Amino acid sequence: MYDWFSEMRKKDPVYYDGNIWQVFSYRYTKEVLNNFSKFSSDLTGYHERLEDLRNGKIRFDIPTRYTMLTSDPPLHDELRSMSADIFSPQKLQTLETFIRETTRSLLDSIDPREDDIVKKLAVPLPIIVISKILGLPIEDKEKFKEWSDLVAFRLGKPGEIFELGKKYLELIGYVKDHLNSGTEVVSRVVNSNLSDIEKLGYIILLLIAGNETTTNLISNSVIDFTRFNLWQRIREENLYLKAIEEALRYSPPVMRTVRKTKERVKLGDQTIEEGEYVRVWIASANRDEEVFHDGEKFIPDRNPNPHLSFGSGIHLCLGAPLARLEARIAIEEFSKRFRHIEILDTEKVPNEVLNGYKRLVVRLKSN
Ligand code: HEM
Ligand SMILES: Brc1ccc(-c2c[nH]cn2)cc1
C-alpha cells in the first residue's frame, strides 16, 4: 500500500476520487487534524443532539456515537477533561510495576518450541491493564477478546467504530452491571451530568477502543525488529524508546482517520466544499520525505521523530502514554527473555484502517 502512497504524495497529495477527499502528505494531514474550526470531528451529530440527549427527548441511541472522539470544542474539551489526569505520564508511572509483572507472568505461558505471541502476549496484555485502571473485572476472558474485536471501520457509517448486534448488547449489559464497581475515573463519569447514553459511551470507549490498537503496536514491533534484524542492536545500545517510536511511524496501528468540513476551505490548491468528508492517511504522512529523511528505511534511533500515529491537535490519543508504556515494557521483557526469534507463520488483520496481526507464530531461544 505504501507504493501507492509514494506516488500520490509526489503527484497528488490532496485528491478527490469523485466520492471523498484524501490527503497523503504530512503538511496537509497535520493541518486537517489541527484545524478543529474548519475540520470537524462531529460525524455522528453529537453536538446537534446534545440537548435532547440530556433532557430525555432521545430515549434510545447507540452509546458509542456520542463520545469525545466524535465531538468538537467545547464539548470535546469538557468530556476529555474528566479523565485526562488518569492517562497522563505522571499518574501512569504508578503502574509500571503491575505491567512489568503481568508481562513476565505472560511470557511464562509461552512455549518456545512453537507459540503464537499475539495470543499469549499481545492480546491479553492491554486487556488486563485497562481492566485494572478502570476497576472492571475480567469475568469472561473470552468475551473481552470478542468485545475488543467489535472495533472496526464500518463502511457508510463514518465515525462509527463499533460493530453492532448481540455481542454489542452484551457489552452494554456488562457495563451497566458494573457501573458501581469502578475506580476513580468511572465514578467521575457516573456522577457527572451526562446522559446515560453518553456515560455508557464514555466507559465503553475507554474500556474497549484502545485494546486491539495496542495489541497491534506490540505485534508490529516484534515483526519489524525481527525482519530488519535489530533485536540485539536495540538491546546492546538500549534503543527501546526510539525503536518503538519508529515502529509507530513505520507500521502505524491506525492507518487513517477522517474529518468533515465545517465550511468551504482551501487545502493546497484544492477547494473542498463545505460538508465533504476528508480522509487523512496517517500512514502515508508518516513517510513524507519532506519531514523524514529516508522515509522508507526503518531507522531504530531516528531523531527527530514527529510521527502522526497518535494523531495531532485536540484529539491526540488520550491513551498514547499508556500505549507507549505497555509496548516498551513488553518489548524489553521479551527482549531479555529470548535471543533468537524465528517467524513461522503470520496472519494479518484483514481490514483496512487497523494494521496488525491476528496470528504471529514463532519459535524462540530462551535465556
Ligand atoms: C498503539 C496504540 C494506539 C494508537 C496507534 C492510537 C491511535 C489514535 C489516533 C490516531 C487517534 C486520533 C483520532 C482522530 O483524531 O480521529 C486516537 C484518539 C483516541 N484514542 Fe487512541 N490509539 C492507541 C491506543 C489507545 C489507548 C490505549 C486508548 C485508551 C485506553 C486510546 C484511546 C483513545 C481515545 C479516547 C481517543 C480520542 C481522544 C480525543 O478525541 O480527545 N487509544 N488514538
Ligand atoms: Br476504526 C478505529 C479503531 C480504533 C481507534 C482507536 C484510537 N485509539 C484507540 N482506538 C481508531 C479508529
For the chain, give the secondary structure using H, E and C: CHHHHHHHHHHCCEEECCCCEEECCHHHHHHHHHCCCCEECCCCCHHHHHHHHHCCCCCCCCHHHCCHHHCCCCHHHHHHHCCCCCCCHHHHHHHHHHHHHHHHHHHHHCCCCCEEHHHHHHCHHHHHHHHHHHCCCCCCHHHHHHHHCCECCCCCCCCCCECCCHHHHHHHHHHHCCHHHCCHHHHHHHHCCCCHHHHHHHHHHHHHCCHHHHHHHHHHHHHHHHHCCCCCHHHHCCCHHHHHHHHHHHCCCECCEEEEECCCEEECCEEECCCCEEEECHHHHCCCCCCCCCCCCCCCCCCCCCCCCCCCHHHCCCCHHHHHHHHHHHHHHHHHHEEEEEEEEEEECCCCCECCEEEEEEEEEEC
CATH number for 294: 1.10.630.10
Q: Is the CB of 159 under 6 A from ligand 2?
A: no
Resolution (A): 2.7
Is 47 among the annotated ligand-binding positions? no
| Dist. CA 359 → ligand 2 center (Å) | 20
Cell 503464537, located at residue? 116
Q: Is the CB of 213 under 6 A from ligand 2?
A: yes
Domain that holds residue 323: 1-367
Number of domains in the chain: 1
Question: Looking at ligand 1, which residue's alpha carbon is closest to its atom 36?
Answer: 317
Ligand number nearest CA of 163 is 2
Question: How far, in Å, CA of 79 to CA of 198, rounded?
Answer: 10
Give 235's contacts (C-beta < 8 A, 6+ positions apart).
335, 336
| Dist. CA 277 → ligand 1 center (Å) | 20
What residues does 16 pair with on adjacent strands? 21
| Dist. CA 365 → ligand 1 center (Å) | 34
275: alpha, beta or left, given left = phi > 0 and alpha = psi -120 to 50?
left
- CA-to-CA separations, 293 to 246, 288, 303, in angstroms, rounded: 13, 9, 10
Ligand number nearest CA of 349 is 2
Q: Name the structure determination technique.
A: X-ray
67: alpha, beta or left, given left = phi > 0 and alpha = psi -120 to 50?
beta
Nearest alpha carbon to residue 121 among 354, 359, 319, 366:
359
Instruction: Please state the atom number of ligand 2 nearest to the C-alpha of residue 317.
Output: 8
